[PDB]
Design a protein around this nucleic acid. Structure first.
Ligand SMILES: Cc1cn([C@H]2C[C@H](O)[C@@H](COP(=O)(O)CP(=O)(O)NP(=O)(O)O)O2)c(=O)[nH]c1=O
Ligand SMILES: [Cl-]
Ligand SMILES: [Mg+2]
Ligand code: NA
Ligand code: NA
Ligand code: NA
Length: 326
DNA sequence: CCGACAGCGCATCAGC
DNA sequence: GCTGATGCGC
DNA sequence: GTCGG
């Protein structure tokens, strides 16, 4: 946290560009800069010093100089005072409300929590659950609670079918002392890249987690991806735990290593690694790593029997999950 | 200068 | 209904 | 907004 002031400023710029400007590449440019500065192991003394880092160009360098000189950024000061921008930024904090819906709601005069609450019938299902748990979803999850949640999910999954394997990924697998949500990778031998010998593989697990009242709400659900809400049980006379976001991703069992590389992240780590793969003439998704032909067209899946195999292909030294928090 | 920026699941809608 | 684009999310 | 070619 040597450069917390700078990385906070860049993140706020990132969020502005995403939510208000709807300029997604600016968003990702700012997040990449924040990431590389966050892991830079010196307290930055100037914009020129920061500009040496990949992802920091002239414009961000000038902003860092302004920020270092004054402790603030005029551009941000004004954005903060703009009502429309402030409203749009707020609304997008609701899960299921993105840049477009936020701006549309503001047009219709819906721009506070109070407005949303009295206009529940103007929300889709995802948005309505996002609003319901607005407070809860912004709270952090202590790793100690993540461990309890892990135990429940792994044990309930076992009770459905002992051949299921559930792996908690995301920030939890990277060793984080707190997480924003729980991400669960799921495999079953019936579901491979070659065949699906059993239906409802994901459904069965979701149903069981609902039965024991762990899963409380659903944001979206298909054959391979569940996005919803869960809650730890609490003891007698205890205040309830907050509700938590949970993502579950069923991946073909022979593609587990690509799947667990993907779901472990971070998102910026994946973007960096996938970008590097492309420069090395490969393409990586959660399923496979494939070569790129001269045309750029993806070839056939390369054999993969470990996370490290994927790193090897693109000539990266292996990085343990705890070192992937970019 | 300027094209590219990771890659994809689910919900929703327009157009047929 | 299907298909493709878009929004939002991982 | 940044970067590689
Ligand atoms: C948001 C996002 C996630 N992912 C993958 C990598 C994440 O580590 C993983 C879980 O996504 P989350 O949105 O839950 C972020 P996290 O890394 O789990 N940290 P936390 O949930 O604690 O905030 O999905 C991507 O590949 N691209 C993405 O844009
Ligand atoms: Cl952009
Ligand atoms: Mg997570
Ligand atoms: Na740079
Ligand atoms: Na949102
Ligand atoms: Na998640």
């Amino acid at each position: 946290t040597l450069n917390g002031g700078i990385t906070d400023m860049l993140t706020e710029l990132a969020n502005f560009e995403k939510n208000v400007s709807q300029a997604i590449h600016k968003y990702n440019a700012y997040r990449k800069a924040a990431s590389v500065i966050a892991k830079y192991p010196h307290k930055i003394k100037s914009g020129a010093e920061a500009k040496k880092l990949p992802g920091v160009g002239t414009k961000i360098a000038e902003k860092i100089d302004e920020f270092l000189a004054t402790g603030k950024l005029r551009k941000l000061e004004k954005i903060r005072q703009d009502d429309t921008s402030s409203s749009i930024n707020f609304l997008t904090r609701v899960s299921g409300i993105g840049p477009s819906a936020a701006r549309k709601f503001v047009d219709e005069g819906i721009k506070t929590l109070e407005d949303l609450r009295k206009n529940e019938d103007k929300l889709n299902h995802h948005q309505r659950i996002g609003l319901k748990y607005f407070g809860d979803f912004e709270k952090r999850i202590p790793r100690e609670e993540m461990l309890q949640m892990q135990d429940i999910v792994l044990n309930e999954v076992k009770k459905v079918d002992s051949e299921y394997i559930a792996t908690v990924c995301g920030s939890f697998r990277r060793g984080a002392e707190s997480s924003g949500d729980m991400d669960v990778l799921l495999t079953h031998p019936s579901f491979t890249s070659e065949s699906t010998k059993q239906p409802k593989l994901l459904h069965q697990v979701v149903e069981q987690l609902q039965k024991v009242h762990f899963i409380t709400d659903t944001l979206s659900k298909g054959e391979t991806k569940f996005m919803g809400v869960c809650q730890l049980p609490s003891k007698n006379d205890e205040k309830e735990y907050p509700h938590r976001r949970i993502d579950i991703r069923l991946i073909p069992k022979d593609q587990y290593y690509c799947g667990v590389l993907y779901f472990t992240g971070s998102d910026i780590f994946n973007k960096n690694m996938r970008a590097h793969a492309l420069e090395k003439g490969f393409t990586i998704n959660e399923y496979t790593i494939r070569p790129l032909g001269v045309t750029g067209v993806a070839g056939e899946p390369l054999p993969v029997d470990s996370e490290k195999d994927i790193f090897d292909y693109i000539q990266w030294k292996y990085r343990e999950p705890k070192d992937r928090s970019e």
